[PDB]
């Protein structure tokens, strides 16, 4: 009688413990599946000259000068992060245009002739945006070889407040 | 139609009560409430659209 | 299984745990104390009290329900607490469902008087249909698949050491240390006092502080050193000298930082000072000259096993107990604790191999007592526990 | 099993009850049915009760079954469910007439529950759904979990559900609601109303309520630029107002924050705790007040963030004038964040997420009811065996 009381209590205790673990697992498993369901719901959602003249304005609103550059700004002062030099009117106009495009969620391509300070323009735009928004990054820059060290020196000189990670050398 | 009959025609069988029960080993001296199964022998409508948002 | 649902209540000396037998966690964990605010009036519950405590109102005073024996000592208040539990937490008439509650292991004496006060509370006052009383160390051990075990419970009141052999509790070998969680609260406070400015009737602030920053400090700063700390120090020093001398890092110099909120102020302890607090549980002779090393947890465990070997071979009981060591209790969760309890046991019993068991899940040991009672309540047969009915009471009432 | 046309979700709350019958399949739509949570109770000489949708010949009394989220009258509450359920049947049975063989043939029910409901209440409701409404499949989904499942399924998080007269605080660890940590404070949206009455004595209730619901009421932490601004009465009357439109939310925000702090501080596994603090979820009508959530976050940060005290840090920086390493603390939280909303439910984005708990239920119900496994709801099979107690074998 006594031996069986103990034997049967031990049995119930072990069964109860395994039931806990089961419930805990089926729970965690249901949760972890809904994450996947969410991911699929998200993927599914994501999947879901005069005509050009009007389509340009319509697509710009969805994304001529007053429309593409609805948000306007004028910056005649160099960002407080840039030191060791001065700015030019051309660089100021380029930076203002790029800032207006960024405020309008628009991209663009620069076609400067030569030696117009493209690295300085990029540094000024990045430093201004980061000082205004307090959003120092993450930011990605693509620099072709034989120019990595020049960009490194320019970043060290003009903008010590912005650090950079550069991959080079042995694997 | 009669609400009760609407309930009856949709979705197509025991019943439980919450009552005193006295376990046995014959019978233990105590009672306690539980959900017991029963033996063999044991209004209006609102209009949605008012409540639809618009 | 059985067609029933029980109310499971555990009144620890510090926390009270309550819930139904049909779910894996308790509905509530509330303090085993209350504020009496003054026309009198009684506040129960963790947030209700912490709110009222922060109000810092005169006449408000915290009183306790459970003495250091782990036994209720204020039965008028206990009823109010039970009422509170049934009314606001489980939300069910106490008259409907079977009740399962806990008692601590005893030597046997206070048992009958307690059982009577429970009859009066369960029957005369609440009208409970029927109740079981499980013995905490026993239930915890059973809930763990063990019929025989050396159960080492480190709670707020102190350490409770209970050998249990083949489902039976060895009462004369039952041992209750006086130093545990609450003791640690006192020491954390006394020691940190000068950095936080601070250096019954003032129960309210003592309590509120114990329940707020002091609780966090314990959970994040204290550690138990694996080996006698005085020895660890001499060693680390002796080693440190050699690294130094050799050329021309002592681990105890690591610093730990605690943000003390009430003054927005950082408190930094070195690792030694962090180890120091729990050392007192093991070598309480280090606070007063009035405590013998034998009041310490290590000697105590040993004492209790040896008193188990006196039944009613010894080097058999010793072997049984030591292969089924259960470490449990809120305070047993302090980092390093299991290992020191083990080192402390292993050296008093070198001939034997120790195997210890412990719930590794943080929550589950804090409420392992309640978890134990729960697994009793889910036992498949009514014959597995003594169930007191209104009858039993009637018959005791006769002469 | 099962038709998506057939899934029925009910979300009853103190003032109203959101209802939906059928899931859209393309994307989830915000519930369109909103029925006031009340029923009329006529008393028929001989004792018994009868329940109607209208005050019948002014003979019935008005029962409001759910108050402060709690069920205060379980019989009127079940009568209210039947009233909803029947109405849906009638509506569909007219429109289509073959309905009892199609859309109405197997109706699974998902009922969103509130933390405060008794086990006794939950069993009685289960009995009612199987016996009186003769429904065959039932999930009782806690509101908190609906929340976390809508929020891209978070294993650890805290739900702050701001009602009208009370706010619930509900921690979730490992997809489980931590009952012993759960609580509500007797404080909610009306608090804002009350704060405002003190600040604008010469206004009345409808004027104050109108400001709260207006485009120019926000919690600060361009409108903010103007000393005064304007808004329009419920009755079209133009009202001007000064700095008061940036007030009234503070006392509530502080109260919630103090509670959140005591709660999360009693999570025993610090590794869980860190996760919860990084997934704070705020829901409820009040929360749609511009600035509110961010203001609440701001306060939790101000009160609870573990970080070096500024004076201490300022000394250390002077000292180093003669780089400063970060002081590491042993406590959490060192990071506090609101959980990230899913941006891919277009209809929901459009209408805001104050009621996102319901999206939780749309997701769960589709998952559960369009897959074979019957692990998370009560079936007739199960009901026949254990009765209402069947409920506890499918808890999450």
UniProtKB/Swiss-Prot annotation, chain A:
It is found in: Nucleus. Residues 1-48 form the HSA domain. Changing residue 122 to F: Temperature-sensitive. ATP binds at residues 112-119. Interacts directly with SFH1, CSE4, histones H3, H4 and H2B, and via its N-terminus, with RSC8. Interacts with LDB7, NPL6 and RTT102. Component of the two forms of the RSC complex composed of at least either RSC1 or RSC2, and ARP7, ARP9, LDB7, NPL6, RSC3, RSC30, RSC4, RSC58, RSC6, RSC8, RSC9, SFH1, STH1, HTL1 and probably RTT102. The complexes interact with histone and histone variant components of centromeric chromatin. Present with 1990 molecules/cell in log phase SD medium. Catalytic component of the chromatin structure-remodeling complex (RSC), which is involved in transcription regulation and nucleosome positioning. RSC is responsible for the transfer of a histone octamer from a nucleosome core particle to naked DNA. The reaction requires ATP and involves an activated RSC-nucleosome intermediate. Remodeling reaction also involves DNA translocation, DNA twist and conformational change. Belongs to the SNF2/RAD54 helicase family. This is Nuclear protein STH1/NPS1. It comes from Saccharomyces cerevisiae (strain ATCC 204508 / S288c) (Baker's yeast). The gene is STH1. The chain holds residues 322 to 554 of 1359 of the full protein.
UniProtKB/Swiss-Prot annotation, chain B:
Coiled coil: none annotated. It is found in: Nucleus. Probable component of the chromatin structure-remodeling complex (RSC) which is involved in transcription regulation and nucleosome positioning. RSC is responsible for the transfer of a histone octamer from a nucleosome core particle to naked DNA. The reaction requires ATP and involves an activated RSC-nucleosome intermediate. Remodeling reaction also involves DNA translocation, DNA twist and conformational change. Present with 1550 molecules/cell in log phase SD medium. Interacts with STH1 and SWI3. Component of the two forms of the RSC complex composed of at least either RSC1 or RSC2, and ARP7, ARP9, LDB7, NPL6, RSC3, RSC30, RSC4, RSC58, RSC6, RSC8, RSC9, SFH1, STH1, HTL1 and probably RTT102. The complexes interact with histone and histone variant components of centromeric chromatin. Probable additional component of the SWI/SNF global transcription activator complex. This is Regulator of Ty1 transposition protein 102. It comes from Saccharomyces cerevisiae (strain ATCC 204508 / S288c). The chain holds residues 2 to 90 of 157 of the full protein.
Curated annotation (Swiss-Prot), chain C:
Changing residue 32 to F: Impaired heterodimerization with ARP9. Temperature-sensitive phenotype. Moderate suppressor of Ty phenotype. One of its GO terms (molecular function) is chromatin binding. Changing residue 344 to K: Impaired heterodimerization with ARP9. Temperature-sensitive phenotype. Moderate suppressor of Ty phenotype. GO terms for biological process: chromatin organization; chromatin remodeling; nucleosome disassembly; positive regulation of transcription by RNA polymerase II; regulation of DNA-templated transcription; regulation of transcription by RNA polymerase II; transcription elongation by RNA polymerase II. It is found in: Nucleus. Keywords: Chromatin regulator, Nucleus, Transcription, Transcription regulation. Gene3D superfamilies: 3.30.420.40, Actin, Chain A, domain 4 (3.90.640.10). The keyword Manganese does not apply. One of its GO terms (cellular component) is SWI/SNF complex. Changing residue 18 to P: Impaired heterodimerization with ARP9. Temperature-sensitive phenotype. Moderate suppressor of Ty phenotype. The keyword DNA repair does not apply. Forms a heterodimer with ARP9. Interacts with NPL6. Component of the two forms of the RSC complex composed of at least either RSC1 or RSC2, and ARP7, ARP9, LDB7, NPL6, RSC3, RSC30, RSC4, RSC58, RSC6, RSC8, RSC9, SFH1, STH1, HTL1 and probably RTT102. The complexes interact with histone and histone variant components of centromeric chromatin. Component of the SWI/SNF global transcription activator complex. Present with 1360 molecules/cell in log phase SD medium. PANTHER family: ACTIN. Belongs to the actin family.
Swiss-Prot record, chain D:
It holds the Pfam family Actin. The keyword Nucleus applies. One of its GO terms (biological process) is nucleosome disassembly. It is found in: Nucleus. Present with 1790 molecules/cell in log phase SD medium. Component of the chromatin structure remodeling complex (RSC), which is involved in transcription regulation and nucleosome positioning. RSC is responsible for the transfer of a histone octamer from a nucleosome core particle to naked DNA. The reaction requires ATP and involves an activated RSC-nucleosome intermediate. Remodeling reaction also involves DNA translocation, DNA twist and conformational change. This is Actin-like protein ARP9. It comes from Saccharomyces cerevisiae (strain ATCC 204508 / S288c). The gene is ARP9.
């Amino acid at each position: 009688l006594h031996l069986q009381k103990i034997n049967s209590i031990i049995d119930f205790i072990k069964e109860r413990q395994s039931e806990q673990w089961s419930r805990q697992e089926r729970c965690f498993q249901f949760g972890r599946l809904g994450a996947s369901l969410h991911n699929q719901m998200e993927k599914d959602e994501q999947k879901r000259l005069d005509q050009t003249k009007d389509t340009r304005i319509t697509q710009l609103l969805r994304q001529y000068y007053e429309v593409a550059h609805r948000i306007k700004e004028k910056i005649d002062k160099q960002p407080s992060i840039l030191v060791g030099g001065t700015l030019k009117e051309y660089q100021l106009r380029g930076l203002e245009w790029m800032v207006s495009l960024y405020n309008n969620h628009l991209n663009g391509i620069l076609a400067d002739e030569m030696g117009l300070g493209k690295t300085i323009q990029s540094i000024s735009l990045i430093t201004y945006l980061y000082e205004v928004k307090k959003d120092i990054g993450p930011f990605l820059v693509i620099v072709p070889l034989s120019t990595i060290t020049n960009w490194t020196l320019e970043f060290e000189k003009w903008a010590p407040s912005l650090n950079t990670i550069i991959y080079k050398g042995t694997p | 139609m009669d609400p009760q009959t609407l309930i009856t025609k949709a979705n197509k069988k025991e019943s439980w009560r919450y009552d005193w029960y006295q376990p046995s080993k014959e019978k233990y001296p105590f009672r306690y409430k539980t959900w017991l199964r029963n033996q063999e022998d044991e209004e209006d409508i609102l209009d949605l659209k008012e409540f639809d948002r618009r | 299984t059985l067609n029933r649902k029980c109310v499971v209540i555990h009144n620890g000396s510090h926390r009270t745990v309550a819930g139904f037998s049909n779910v894996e966690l308790p509905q509530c964990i509330i303090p085993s104390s209350y504020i009496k605010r003054t026309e009198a009036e009684f506040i129960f519950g963790t947030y209700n009290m912490i709110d009222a405590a922060a109000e810092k109102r005169n006449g408000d005073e915290v009183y306790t329900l459970v003495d250091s024996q782990g036994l209720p000592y204020n039965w008028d208040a206990l009823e109010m607490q039970w009422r509170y539990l049934y009314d606001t937490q489980l939300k069910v008439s106490p008259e409907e469902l079977p009740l399962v509650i806990t008692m601590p292991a005893t030597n046997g004496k206070p048992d009958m008087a307690i059982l009577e006060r429970y009859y009066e509370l369960a029957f005369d006052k609440l009208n409970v249909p029927v109740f079981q009383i499980v013995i905490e160390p026993l239930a915890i051990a059973l809930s763990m698949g063990k019929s025989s075990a050396f159960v080492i419970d480190i709670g707020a009141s102190g350490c409770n050491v209970t050998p249990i052999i083949d489902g039976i509790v060895v009462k004369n070998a039952v041992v209750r240390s006086k130093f545990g969680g609450d003791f640690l609260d006192f020491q954390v406070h006394e020691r940190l006092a000068p950095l936080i400015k601070e250096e019954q009737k003032r129960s309210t602030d003592v309590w509120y502080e114990a329940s707020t920053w002091i609780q966090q400090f314990k959970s994040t700063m204290l550690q138990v050193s694996e080996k006698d700390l005085f020895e660890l120090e001499r060693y680390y020093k002796e080693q440190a000298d050699i690294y130094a001398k050799q050329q021309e890092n002592n681990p105890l110099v690591q610093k730990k930082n605690f943000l003390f909120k009430p003054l927005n102020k950082t408190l930094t302890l070195d690792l030694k000072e962090c180890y120091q607090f729990a050392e007192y549980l093991f070598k309480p002779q280090l606070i007063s000259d009035k405590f013998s090393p034998e009041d310490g947890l290590g000697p105590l465990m040993a004492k209790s096993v040896k008193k188990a070997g006196a039944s009613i071979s010894p080097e058999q009981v010793y072997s049984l107990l030591l292969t089924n060591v259960i470490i449990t209790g809120s305070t047993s969760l302090i980092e390093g604790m299991e290992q020191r309890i083990i080192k402390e046991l292993s050296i008093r019993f070198p001939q034997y191999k120790l195997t210890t068991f412990a719930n590794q899940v943080m929550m589950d040991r804090k409420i392992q007592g309640w978890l134990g009672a729960l697994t009793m309540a889910n036992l498949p047969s009514w014959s597995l526990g003594k169930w007191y009915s209104k009858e039993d009471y009637e018959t005791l009432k006769r002469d | 099993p099962f038709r998506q046309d057939s899934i029925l979700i009910i979300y009853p709350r103190s003032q109203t009850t959101l209802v939906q019958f059928g899931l859209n399949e393309e994307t989830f739509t915000v519930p369109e049915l909103e029925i006031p949570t009340q029923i009329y109770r006529t008393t028929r000489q001989d004792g018994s009760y009868t329940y109607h949708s209208t005050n019948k010949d002014n003979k019935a009394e008005l029962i409001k079954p759910i108050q402060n989220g709690e069920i205060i009258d379980i019989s009127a509450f079940t009568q209210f469910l039947r009233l909803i359920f029947v109405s849906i049947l009638s509506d569909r049975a007219n429109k289509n007439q073959d309905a009892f063989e199609a859309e109405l043939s197997n109706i699974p029910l998902l009922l969103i529950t509130h933390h405060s409901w008794s086990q006794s209440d939950l069993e009685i409701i289960t009995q009612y759904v199987f016996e009186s409404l003769e429904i065959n499949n039932l999930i009782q989904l806690p509101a908190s979990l609906a929340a976390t499942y809508s929020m891209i399924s978070l294993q650890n998080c805290c739900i702050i559900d701001v009602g009208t007269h009370h706010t619930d605080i509900i921690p979730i660890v490992d997809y489980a609601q931590l009952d012993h940590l759960v609580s509500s404070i007797p404080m909610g949206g009306q608090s804002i109303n009350d704060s405002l009455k003190k600040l604008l004595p010469q206004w009345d209730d409808d004027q104050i309520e109108s400001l709260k619901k207006s485009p120019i009421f926000e919690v600060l932490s361009k409108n903010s630029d103007l000393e005064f601004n304007t808004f329009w009465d419920e009755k079209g009357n133009e009202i001007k107002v000064g700095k008061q439109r940036f007030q009234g939310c503070n006392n509530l925000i502080k109260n919630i924050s103090n509670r959140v702090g005591l709660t999360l501080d009693n999570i025993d596994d610090i590794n869980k705790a860190k996760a919860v603090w990084e997934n704070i979820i705020i829901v409820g009508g009040t929360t749609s007040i511009s600035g509110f959530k961010e203001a609440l976050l701001g306060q939790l940060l101000k009160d609870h963030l573990i970080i070096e005290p500024e004076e201490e840090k300022s000394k250390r920086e002077e000292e180093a004038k003669s780089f400063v390493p970060t002081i590491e603390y042993v406590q959490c939280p060192t990071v506090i964040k609101l959980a990230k909303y899913p941006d891919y439910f277009p209809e929901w984005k459009k209408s805001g997420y104050s009621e996102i708990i319901f999206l939780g239920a749309q997701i769960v119900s589709k998952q559960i009811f369009t897959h074979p496994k019957d692990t998370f709801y009560i079936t007739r099979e199960k009901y026949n065996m254990k009765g209402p107690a069947a409920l506890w074998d499918v808890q999450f």
